Design an enzyme around this catalytic site. Sequence first.
Site, PDB file in Angstrom:
ATOM      1  N   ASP A  25      -2.990  -5.740 -16.160  1.00 37.17           N
ATOM      2  CA  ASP A  25      -3.085  -4.381 -15.632  1.00 37.17           C
ATOM      3  C   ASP A  25      -1.781  -3.838 -15.072  1.00 37.17           C
ATOM      4  O   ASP A  25      -1.410  -4.147 -13.940  1.00 37.17           O
ATOM      5  CB  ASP A  25      -4.160  -4.413 -14.537  1.00 37.17           C
ATOM      6  N   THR A  26      -1.128  -2.979 -15.846  1.00 27.52           N
ATOM      7  CA  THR A  26       0.138  -2.365 -15.427  1.00 27.52           C
ATOM      8  C   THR A  26      -0.073  -1.292 -14.366  1.00 27.52           C
ATOM      9  O   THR A  26       0.882  -0.780 -13.794  1.00 27.52           O
ATOM     10  CB  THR A  26       0.869  -1.745 -16.619  1.00 27.52           C
ATOM     11  N   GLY A  27      -1.330  -0.937 -14.122  1.00 30.54           N
ATOM     12  CA  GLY A  27      -1.634   0.067 -13.118  1.00 30.54           C
ATOM     13  C   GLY A  27      -1.976  -0.549 -11.776  1.00 30.54           C
ATOM     14  O   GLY A  27      -2.375   0.149 -10.853  1.00 30.54           O
TER      15      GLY A  27
HETATM   16  C1  LIG Z   1      -9.991   4.314 -12.970  1.00 26.97           C
HETATM   17  C2  LIG Z   1      -9.328   3.661 -14.148  1.00 26.97           C
HETATM   18  C3  LIG Z   1     -10.298   3.069 -15.168  1.00 26.97           C
HETATM   19  C4  LIG Z   1     -11.448   4.045 -15.391  1.00 26.97           C
HETATM   20  C5  LIG Z   1     -10.842   1.692 -14.683  1.00 26.97           C
HETATM   21  N1  LIG Z   1      -9.796   0.661 -14.607  1.00 26.97           N
HETATM   22  C6  LIG Z   1      -9.170   0.337 -13.479  1.00 26.97           C
HETATM   23  O1  LIG Z   1      -9.410   0.873 -12.395  1.00 26.97           O
HETATM   24  C7  LIG Z   1      -8.131  -0.779 -13.603  1.00 26.97           C
HETATM   25  N2  LIG Z   1      -6.737  -0.489 -13.151  1.00 26.97           N
HETATM   26  C8  LIG Z   1      -6.595  -0.183 -11.725  1.00 26.97           C
HETATM   27  C9  LIG Z   1      -5.708   1.047 -11.593  1.00 26.97           C
HETATM   28  O2  LIG Z   1      -6.310   2.142 -12.290  1.00 26.97           O
HETATM   29  C10 LIG Z   1      -5.536   1.436 -10.136  1.00 26.97           C
HETATM   30  C11 LIG Z   1      -4.681   2.698 -10.044  1.00 26.97           C
HETATM   31  C12 LIG Z   1      -4.504   3.201  -8.642  1.00 26.97           C
HETATM   32  C13 LIG Z   1      -3.245   3.224  -8.046  1.00 26.97           C
HETATM   33  C14 LIG Z   1      -3.081   3.660  -6.744  1.00 26.97           C
HETATM   34  C15 LIG Z   1      -4.186   4.079  -6.024  1.00 26.97           C
HETATM   35  O3  LIG Z   1      -4.041   4.504  -4.723  1.00 26.97           O
HETATM   36  C16 LIG Z   1      -5.445   4.068  -6.595  1.00 26.97           C
HETATM   37  C17 LIG Z   1      -5.596   3.630  -7.898  1.00 26.97           C
HETATM   38  N3  LIG Z   1      -4.927   0.357  -9.354  1.00 26.97           N
HETATM   39  C18 LIG Z   1      -5.601  -0.307  -8.420  1.00 26.97           C
HETATM   40  O4  LIG Z   1      -6.778  -0.052  -8.119  1.00 26.97           O
HETATM   41  C19 LIG Z   1      -4.817  -1.391  -7.691  1.00 26.97           C
HETATM   42  C20 LIG Z   1      -5.707  -2.597  -7.293  1.00 26.97           C
HETATM   43  C21 LIG Z   1      -6.319  -3.233  -8.527  1.00 26.97           C
HETATM   44  C22 LIG Z   1      -4.880  -3.634  -6.561  1.00 26.97           C
HETATM   45  N4  LIG Z   1      -4.254  -0.779  -6.489  1.00 26.97           N
HETATM   46  C23 LIG Z   1      -4.943  -0.323  -5.251  1.00 26.97           C
HETATM   47  C24 LIG Z   1      -3.833   0.442  -4.485  1.00 26.97           C
HETATM   48  C25 LIG Z   1      -2.498   0.142  -5.130  1.00 26.97           C
HETATM   49  C26 LIG Z   1      -2.946  -0.487  -6.415  1.00 26.97           C
HETATM   50  O5  LIG Z   1      -2.166  -0.722  -7.343  1.00 26.97           O
HETATM   51  C27 LIG Z   1      -8.680  -2.047 -12.950  1.00 26.97           C
HETATM   52  C28 LIG Z   1     -10.137  -2.239 -13.270  1.00 26.97           C
HETATM   53  C29 LIG Z   1     -10.545  -2.591 -14.558  1.00 26.97           C
HETATM   54  C30 LIG Z   1     -11.884  -2.635 -14.895  1.00 26.97           C
HETATM   55  C31 LIG Z   1     -12.833  -2.326 -13.936  1.00 26.97           C
HETATM   56  C32 LIG Z   1     -12.453  -1.990 -12.650  1.00 26.97           C
HETATM   57  C33 LIG Z   1     -11.114  -1.950 -12.323  1.00 26.97           C
HETATM   58  O6  LIG Z   1     -14.170  -2.319 -14.249  1.00 26.97           O
HETATM   59  C34 LIG Z   1     -14.625  -2.094 -15.569  1.00 26.97           C
HETATM   60  C35 LIG Z   1     -15.037  -0.640 -15.778  1.00 26.97           C
HETATM   61  C36 LIG Z   1     -13.915   0.213 -16.365  1.00 26.97           C
HETATM   62  N5  LIG Z   1     -12.976   0.756 -15.395  1.00 26.97           N
HETATM   63  C37 LIG Z   1     -11.754   1.122 -15.772  1.00 26.97           C
HETATM   64  O7  LIG Z   1     -11.333   0.976 -16.928  1.00 26.97           O
END
Ligand SMILES: CC[C@H](C)[C@@H]1NC(=O)[C@@H](NC[C@@H](O)[C@H](Cc2ccc(O)cc2)NC(=O)[C@H](C(C)C)N2CCCC2=O)Cc2ccc(cc2)OCCCNC1=O
Lengths: 99, 99
Positions: A25-27
């Site tokens: 996860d690059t995000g």
């Molecule tokens: C919202 C993005 C998409 C929709 C989501 N993917 C993510 O959130 C994925 N990537 C996470 C990324 O979008 C998200 C972006 C972000 C950045 C700063 C913020 O202040 C708030 C959000 N990053 C984080 O949540 C990360 C955390 C994983 C440590 N955070 C929290 C704050 C700083 C940070 O980098 C991780 C994930 C994958 C599958 C998941 C749940 C989570 O369940 C399956 C279901 C599918 N979910 C997804 O594909």
Amino acid sequence: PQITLWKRPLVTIRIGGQLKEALLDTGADDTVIEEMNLPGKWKPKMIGGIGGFIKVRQYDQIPVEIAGHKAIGTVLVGPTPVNIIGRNLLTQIGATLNF
Amino acid sequence: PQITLWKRPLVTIRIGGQLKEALLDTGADDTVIEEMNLPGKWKPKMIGGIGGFIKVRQYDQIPVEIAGHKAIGTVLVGPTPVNIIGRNLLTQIGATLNF
Ligand SMILES: CC[C@H](C)[C@@H]1NC(=O)[C@@H](NC[C@@H](O)[C@H](Cc2ccc(O)cc2)NC(=O)[C@H](C(C)C)N2CCCC2=O)Cc2ccc(cc2)OCCCNC1=O
């Protein structure tokens, strides 16, 4: 390896001497692993993404093997829907985005 | 271009005639854009992040330019702290993970 994004970029990792599946996860700034028993001390922490904040256990200097590549860093253990390998470990194995 | 992960992979995008900064997220199945008044028909949807789910509006066939690269697909608009470009759009610009 060159990984395309037609499917979720999931790979096998080894942590605590145990094999698991994790998402590259690059995000994600950090690495969050599903609740499990990890050797050593931990400090309680709180992180928050979309949907809200969750309480996690912070383990430092934890060795993780990602697709055969070694990394040693901080790993947060908590109630996550998926095991996430964030930038803190991705940089250690020299992962980059290309297009 | 090759993007290292020392920092968050934020790039400039163009949507609805506006320019915005967005995070290239290989861990995102979908593309989530901050609340904006995009014209056109939409459908309610709920997506989950690390801490839970949020209500969003789904728009289809929305033209989005990522770093000068044209793309077109589904965009979810909702209360997000950051604009997130997911795999649905990253594949269109030929993005890959390499290590
Ligand atoms: C919202 C993005 C998409 C929709 C989501 N993917 C993510 O959130 C994925 N990537 C996470 C990324 O979008 C998200 C972006 C972000 C950045 C700063 C913020 O202040 C708030 C959000 N990053 C984080 O949540 C990360 C955390 C994983 C440590 N955070 C929290 C704050 C700083 C940070 O980098 C991780 C994930 C994958 C599958 C998941 C749940 C989570 O369940 C399956 C279901 C599918 N979910 C997804 O594909």
